[PDB]
Design a protein around this ligand. Structure first.
Ligand SMILES: COc1ccc(S(=O)(=O)n2cc(CCC(=O)O)c3cc(OC)ccc32)cc1
Lengths: 16, 260
């Protein structure tokens, strides 16, 4: 069960 | 939302747009028109002019592909900063924020690319260069098919004569699309988009009294952008399946992975 944030590390990081 | 609020939203977006995107349509068209005190862009029209101009801006086709990819990566970062400024966006489930960018970023890239294009070519490297449409089209099979669909879109899109203020809201509208695959919670997203579309409708009526049905025309372009992505992806597939040292930047890779 992998979330969007889990499979988009760079985007998640950009969003932070 | 009543008019005053819609106008405040439009200005809010415009200001963040200006802070997020270094090269605006205003600047771009000034350069394209020669109506700037700035020195004319260096023109890339062939292999020689490319190598030669690499002072202000493998094989040629692949060098151009890599330049574009470098730019896309920077554009995604700029679009992400802009998204975070759209009222309500950062209050959404982080996973939905990721989905909206995943699907929205390339559509926005093509939208903004139009600002940099005329029917003859496109501004590159902060507007310091101008690469010809003819040159791009001459790139060996796979690579010469990449930009042309974007030129064809840009020519029709540019005929709507939108300015940066119009575009700020339009891009926000595209980002806040509630029908992206895999969204966890559509209602909050559609609520925001409803406000943005209202702001857009008002913006276009005030800023373009002469363009009857401009809102309607612009709405149809949102769907054109989706088709461009579909075609682009198919072309990326060919590059993947039958090319030498071809590898995408990790940010692009995560964007395209499981896209649709
Ligand atoms: C000048 O700035 C830009 C920014 C984006 C574009 S683009 O049309 O989206 N585009 C994207 C890629 C690869 C990377 C990705 O898939 O994002 C690409 C490769 C090409 O090979 C010659 C031509 C156009 C390309 C064009 C110019």
């Amino acid at each position: 069960h992998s979330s969007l944030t889990e499979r988009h590390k760079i985007l998640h990081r950009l969003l932070q | 939302m009543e008019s005053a609020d819609l106008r405040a939203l439009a200005k809010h977006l415009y200001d963040s747009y200006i802070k997020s995107f270094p090269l605006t349509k205003a600047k771009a068209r000034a350069i394209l028109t020669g109506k700037t005190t700035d020195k004319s862009p260096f023109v890339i029209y062939d292999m020689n002019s490319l190598m030669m101009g690499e002072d202000k801006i493998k094989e040629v086709a692949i060098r151009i592909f890599q330049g574009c990819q470098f730019r896309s990566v920077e554009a995604v970062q700029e679009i992400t900063e802009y998204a975070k400024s759209i009222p309500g966006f950062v209050n959404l489930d982080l996973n939905d924020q990721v989905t909206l960018l995943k699907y929205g970023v390339h559509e926005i890239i093509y939208t903004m690319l139009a600002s940099l294009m005329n029917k003859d070519g496109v501004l590159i490297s902060e507007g310091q260069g101008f690469m010809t449409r003819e040159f791009l089209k001459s790139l060996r099979k796979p690579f010469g098919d990449f930009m042309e669909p974007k030129f064809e879109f840009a020519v029709k899109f540019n005929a709507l004569e939108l300015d940066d203020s119009d575009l700020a809201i339009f891009i926000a509208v595209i980002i806040l699309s509630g029908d992206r695959p895999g969204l966890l919670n559509v209602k909050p997203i559609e609520d925001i988009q409803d406000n943005l579309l209202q702001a857009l409708e008002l913006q276009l009526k005030l800023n373009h009294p002469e363009s009857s049905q401009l809102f309607a025309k612009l709405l149809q372009k949102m769907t054109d952008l989706r088709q461009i992505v579909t075609e682009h992806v198919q072309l990326l597939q060919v590059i993947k399946k039958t090319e030498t040292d071809m590898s995408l930047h990790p940010l692009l890779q995560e964007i395209y992975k499981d896209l649709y």
